[PDB]
PDB file of C-alpha atoms in Angstrom:
ATOM      1  CA  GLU H   1     -18.805  16.359 -12.927  1.00 12.39           C
ATOM      2  CA  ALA H   2     -22.025  15.735 -11.803  1.00 12.58           C
ATOM      3  CA  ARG H   3     -21.825  11.969 -12.347  1.00 13.61           C
ATOM      4  CA  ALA H   4     -18.928  11.608  -9.567  1.00 12.97           C
ATOM      5  CA  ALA H   5     -19.936  13.177  -6.901  1.00 13.95           C
ATOM      6  CA  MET H   6     -23.166  11.792  -7.314  1.00 11.21           C
ATOM      7  CA  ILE H   7     -20.888   8.301  -6.549  1.00 11.77           C
ATOM      8  CA  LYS H   8     -18.460   9.905  -4.391  1.00 12.47           C
ATOM      9  CA  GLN H   9     -21.795  11.044  -2.333  1.00 12.22           C
ATOM     10  CA  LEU H  10     -23.343   7.310  -2.292  1.00  9.66           C
ATOM     11  CA  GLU H  11     -19.738   5.576  -2.165  1.00  5.67           C
ATOM     12  CA  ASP H  12     -19.487   7.184   1.602  1.00  4.92           C
ATOM     13  CA  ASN H  13     -22.867   6.968   2.047  1.00  3.80           C
ATOM     14  CA  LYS H  14     -22.235   2.364   1.827  1.00  2.00           C
ATOM     15  CA  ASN H  15     -18.491   3.118   3.269  1.00  2.32           C
ATOM     16  CA  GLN H  16     -19.661   3.704   6.199  1.00  5.00           C
ATOM     17  CA  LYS H  17     -21.969   1.686   6.615  1.00  4.62           C
ATOM     18  CA  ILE H  18     -19.726  -0.849   5.441  1.00  5.00           C
ATOM     19  CA  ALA H  19     -17.309  -0.131   8.393  1.00  6.27           C
ATOM     20  CA  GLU H  20     -19.571   0.349  10.163  1.00  4.86           C
ATOM     21  CA  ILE H  21     -22.031  -3.334  10.129  1.00  6.30           C
ATOM     22  CA  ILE H  22     -17.410  -4.179  10.195  1.00  2.21           C
ATOM     23  CA  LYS H  23     -16.859  -3.036  13.572  1.00  2.81           C
ATOM     24  CA  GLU H  24     -20.838  -3.831  15.688  1.00  2.00           C
ATOM     25  CA  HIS H  25     -19.859  -7.635  14.003  1.00  2.00           C
ATOM     26  CA  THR H  26     -16.371  -7.950  15.280  1.00  2.00           C
ATOM     27  CA  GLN H  27     -18.213  -5.970  19.248  1.00  2.00           C
ATOM     28  CA  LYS H  28     -20.680  -8.955  19.337  1.00  2.00           C
ATOM     29  CA  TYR H  29     -18.331 -11.113  18.097  1.00  2.00           C
ATOM     30  CA  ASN H  30     -15.904 -10.254  21.294  1.00  2.00           C
ATOM     31  CA  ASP H  31     -18.455  -9.105  23.963  1.00  2.00           C
ATOM     32  CA  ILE H  32     -20.336 -13.602  23.526  1.00  2.00           C
ATOM     33  CA  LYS H  33     -16.358 -14.524  23.151  1.00  2.00           C
ATOM     34  CA  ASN H  34     -15.836 -12.179  26.663  1.00  2.00           C
ATOM     35  CA  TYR H  35     -18.939 -13.869  28.293  1.00  2.00           C
ATOM     36  CA  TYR H  36     -17.842 -17.043  27.301  1.00  2.00           C
ATOM     37  CA  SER H  37     -14.053 -16.916  28.016  1.00  2.00           C
ATOM     38  CA  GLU H  38     -14.773 -16.001  31.164  1.00  2.00           C
ATOM     39  CA  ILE H  39     -17.361 -18.511  32.110  1.00  2.00           C
ATOM     40  CA  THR H  40     -14.829 -21.372  31.305  1.00  2.00           C
ATOM     41  CA  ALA H  41     -12.502 -19.574  33.630  1.00  2.00           C
ATOM     42  CA  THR H  42     -14.721 -19.666  36.869  1.00  2.00           C
ATOM     43  CA  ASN H  43     -15.106 -23.695  35.338  1.00  2.00           C
ATOM     44  CA  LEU H  44     -12.022 -24.245  35.660  1.00  2.00           C
ATOM     45  CA  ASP H  45     -11.867 -22.334  39.220  1.00  2.00           C
ATOM     46  CA  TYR H  46     -14.471 -24.532  39.736  1.00  2.00           C
ATOM     47  CA  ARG H  47     -13.601 -27.998  39.648  1.00  2.00           C
ATOM     48  CA  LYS H  48     -11.103 -27.921  42.308  1.00  2.00           C
ATOM     49  CA  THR H  49     -13.257 -28.705  44.726  1.00  2.00           C
ATOM     50  CA  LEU H  50     -14.123 -32.141  42.897  1.00  2.00           C
ATOM     51  CA  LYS H  51     -10.771 -32.325  42.982  1.00  2.00           C
ATOM     52  CA  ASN H  52     -10.423 -31.649  46.328  1.00  2.00           C
ATOM     53  CA  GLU H  53     -13.394 -33.818  47.711  1.00  2.00           C
TER      54      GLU H  53
ATOM     55  CA  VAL R   1     -15.083  17.640 -48.937  1.00  2.00           C
ATOM     56  CA  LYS R   2     -16.562  13.807 -49.100  1.00  2.00           C
ATOM     57  CA  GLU R   3     -12.670  13.286 -47.730  1.00  2.00           C
ATOM     58  CA  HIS R   4     -12.952  15.606 -44.891  1.00  2.00           C
ATOM     59  CA  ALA R   5     -16.636  14.488 -44.208  1.00  2.00           C
ATOM     60  CA  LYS R   6     -15.487  10.346 -43.549  1.00  2.00           C
ATOM     61  CA  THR R   7     -11.989  11.595 -41.108  1.00  2.00           C
ATOM     62  CA  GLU R   8     -13.580  13.109 -39.572  1.00  2.00           C
ATOM     63  CA  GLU R   9     -15.679  10.420 -39.001  1.00  2.00           C
ATOM     64  CA  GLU R  10     -13.353   8.311 -38.401  1.00  2.00           C
ATOM     65  CA  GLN R  11     -11.448  10.601 -35.381  1.00  2.00           C
ATOM     66  CA  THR R  12     -14.470   9.992 -33.493  1.00  2.00           C
ATOM     67  CA  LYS R  13     -15.834   6.822 -33.917  1.00  2.00           C
ATOM     68  CA  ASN R  14     -10.923   6.383 -32.566  1.00  2.00           C
ATOM     69  CA  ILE R  15     -12.441   8.867 -29.628  1.00  2.00           C
ATOM     70  CA  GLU R  16     -15.715   6.913 -29.244  1.00  4.31           C
ATOM     71  CA  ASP R  17     -13.915   3.513 -29.053  1.00  4.38           C
ATOM     72  CA  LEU R  18     -11.440   4.987 -26.808  1.00  6.01           C
ATOM     73  CA  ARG R  19     -13.810   6.383 -24.349  1.00  5.06           C
ATOM     74  CA  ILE R  20     -15.787   2.886 -24.101  1.00  2.69           C
ATOM     75  CA  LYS R  21     -12.599   0.780 -23.718  1.00  2.07           C
ATOM     76  CA  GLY R  22     -11.479   2.976 -20.670  1.00  5.06           C
ATOM     77  CA  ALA R  23     -14.505   3.327 -18.971  1.00  5.99           C
ATOM     78  CA  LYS R  24     -14.973  -0.646 -19.276  1.00  6.59           C
ATOM     79  CA  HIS R  25     -11.476  -1.817 -18.265  1.00  6.25           C
ATOM     80  CA  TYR R  26     -12.398   0.986 -15.366  1.00  5.71           C
ATOM     81  CA  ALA R  27     -14.680  -1.253 -14.081  1.00  3.87           C
ATOM     82  CA  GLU R  28     -13.179  -4.519 -14.451  1.00  3.70           C
ATOM     83  CA  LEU R  29     -10.115  -2.958 -12.448  1.00  3.41           C
ATOM     84  CA  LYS R  30     -12.156  -1.966  -9.776  1.00  6.11           C
ATOM     85  CA  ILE R  31     -14.399  -5.446  -9.360  1.00  4.08           C
ATOM     86  CA  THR R  32     -11.350  -7.345  -9.228  1.00  3.35           C
ATOM     87  CA  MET R  33      -9.092  -5.367  -6.884  1.00  2.00           C
ATOM     88  CA  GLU R  34     -12.040  -5.113  -4.470  1.00  2.00           C
ATOM     89  CA  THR R  35     -12.229  -8.735  -5.280  1.00  2.00           C
ATOM     90  CA  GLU R  36      -9.693  -9.885  -2.305  1.00  2.00           C
ATOM     91  CA  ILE R  37     -10.607  -6.633   1.052  1.00  2.00           C
ATOM     92  CA  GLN R  38     -13.463  -7.717   2.490  1.00  2.00           C
ATOM     93  CA  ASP R  39     -12.897 -11.576   3.552  1.00  2.00           C
ATOM     94  CA  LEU R  40     -10.722 -11.148   6.565  1.00  2.00           C
ATOM     95  CA  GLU R  41     -10.595  -9.508   9.828  1.00  2.00           C
ATOM     96  CA  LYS R  42     -12.933 -10.993  11.914  1.00  2.00           C
ATOM     97  CA  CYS R  43     -12.328 -15.466  11.023  1.00  2.00           C
ATOM     98  CA  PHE R  44      -8.904 -14.606  12.699  1.00  2.00           C
ATOM     99  CA  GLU R  45     -11.120 -13.782  15.861  1.00  2.00           C
ATOM    100  CA  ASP R  46     -12.399 -16.911  15.448  1.00  2.00           C
ATOM    101  CA  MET R  47      -9.644 -18.340  15.028  1.00  2.00           C
ATOM    102  CA  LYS R  48      -8.383 -17.381  18.385  1.00  2.00           C
TER     103      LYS R  48
ATOM    104  CA  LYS N   1      -4.749   9.337 -29.854  1.00  2.00           C
ATOM    105  CA  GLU N   2      -1.810   9.384 -27.307  1.00  2.00           C
ATOM    106  CA  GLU N   3      -3.344  11.147 -24.855  1.00  2.00           C
ATOM    107  CA  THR N   4      -6.762   8.861 -24.241  1.00  2.00           C
ATOM    108  CA  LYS N   5      -3.847   6.371 -23.937  1.00  2.00           C
ATOM    109  CA  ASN N   6      -2.339   8.892 -21.559  1.00  2.00           C
ATOM    110  CA  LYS N   7      -4.747   9.836 -18.682  1.00  2.00           C
ATOM    111  CA  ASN N   8      -6.072   6.335 -18.638  1.00  2.00           C
ATOM    112  CA  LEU N   9      -2.977   4.478 -17.228  1.00  2.00           C
ATOM    113  CA  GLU N  10      -1.869   7.709 -15.160  1.00  2.00           C
ATOM    114  CA  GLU N  11      -5.893   7.977 -13.084  1.00  2.00           C
ATOM    115  CA  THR N  12      -5.258   3.790 -13.116  1.00  2.00           C
ATOM    116  CA  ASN N  13      -1.720   3.565 -11.457  1.00  2.00           C
ATOM    117  CA  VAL N  14      -2.517   6.307  -9.639  1.00  2.00           C
ATOM    118  CA  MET N  15      -5.400   4.324  -7.757  1.00  2.00           C
ATOM    119  CA  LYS N  16      -3.724   0.695  -8.160  1.00  2.00           C
ATOM    120  CA  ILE N  17      -1.159   2.065  -6.183  1.00  2.00           C
ATOM    121  CA  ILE N  18      -3.356   3.523  -4.083  1.00  2.00           C
ATOM    122  CA  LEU N  19      -5.300   1.591  -2.572  1.00  5.85           C
ATOM    123  CA  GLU N  20      -2.513  -1.057  -2.698  1.00  8.58           C
ATOM    124  CA  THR N  21      -1.828   0.511  -0.019  1.00  7.75           C
ATOM    125  CA  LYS N  22      -4.642   0.947   1.873  1.00  5.43           C
ATOM    126  CA  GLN N  23      -5.572  -3.061   0.724  1.00  2.80           C
ATOM    127  CA  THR N  24      -1.937  -4.164   2.109  1.00  5.73           C
ATOM    128  CA  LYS N  25      -2.162  -3.222   5.715  1.00  5.77           C
ATOM    129  CA  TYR N  26      -4.316  -5.808   6.436  1.00  5.57           C
ATOM    130  CA  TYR N  27      -2.995  -8.616   7.509  1.00  8.63           C
ATOM    131  CA  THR N  28      -0.469 -10.054  10.291  1.00 10.98           C
ATOM    132  CA  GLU N  29      -2.338 -12.789  13.068  1.00  9.08           C
ATOM    133  CA  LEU N  30      -2.316 -15.635  11.042  1.00  8.64           C
ATOM    134  CA  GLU N  31      -0.158 -17.267   9.864  1.00  8.91           C
ATOM    135  CA  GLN N  32       1.572 -15.832  13.840  1.00  9.67           C
ATOM    136  CA  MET N  33      -1.558 -16.855  15.828  1.00 11.58           C
ATOM    137  CA  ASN N  34      -1.702 -20.278  13.966  1.00 13.60           C
ATOM    138  CA  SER N  35       2.270 -20.787  14.637  1.00 13.23           C
ATOM    139  CA  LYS N  36       2.164 -20.062  18.200  1.00 13.29           C
ATOM    140  CA  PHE N  37      -0.826 -22.359  18.738  1.00  9.18           C
ATOM    141  CA  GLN N  38       1.055 -25.379  17.852  1.00  8.42           C
ATOM    142  CA  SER N  39       5.223 -24.106  18.311  1.00 10.21           C
ATOM    143  CA  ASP N  40       3.993 -24.321  22.534  1.00 10.16           C
ATOM    144  CA  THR N  41       1.167 -26.973  21.942  1.00 13.00           C
ATOM    145  CA  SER N  42       3.437 -29.721  20.246  1.00 13.77           C
ATOM    146  CA  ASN N  43       4.528 -30.366  23.754  1.00 15.13           C
ATOM    147  CA  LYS N  44       1.346 -30.365  25.397  1.00 18.49           C
ATOM    148  CA  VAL N  45       1.279 -33.164  22.699  1.00 21.23           C
ATOM    149  CA  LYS N  46       3.945 -34.419  22.876  1.00 23.59           C
ATOM    150  CA  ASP N  47       2.212 -35.027  26.843  1.00 24.80           C
ATOM    151  CA  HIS N  48      -0.781 -36.261  25.163  1.00 23.97           C
ATOM    152  CA  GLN N  49       0.431 -39.152  23.125  1.00 24.74           C
ATOM    153  CA  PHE N  50       3.173 -40.253  25.797  1.00 27.24           C
TER     154      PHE N  50
END
């Protein structure tokens, strides 16, 4: 039972680590993608000036 | 007396071997199942 | 001898189905997103071609 308690403790610690790593990587990917997406939307709105010119 | 002593030895060996088989099966199943879990999620955001 | 198999199979199946319910929770978007791309992209592809 002590072995089991140790196993579950370390499992919980490292499962927290796994889930949190997945999380912050997901949010970092989202931030970068949104930055470039808004940049592209601005460029698409911008090219109309070239077309009118 | 010899027969009884040897017999209990067979029972002890059977118990130990079954325990070892159970531990190995447990580890094998755990790893095999966990094989196909992590390689998902963000991959779908890449395709989006 | 019977009990060894009994406990092993019982605990193994409990864990297997419980973790299966946990795992089967993750995938809905791959095929749907691909198909929902090509469905409205086929007309664009035909425009490009012609």
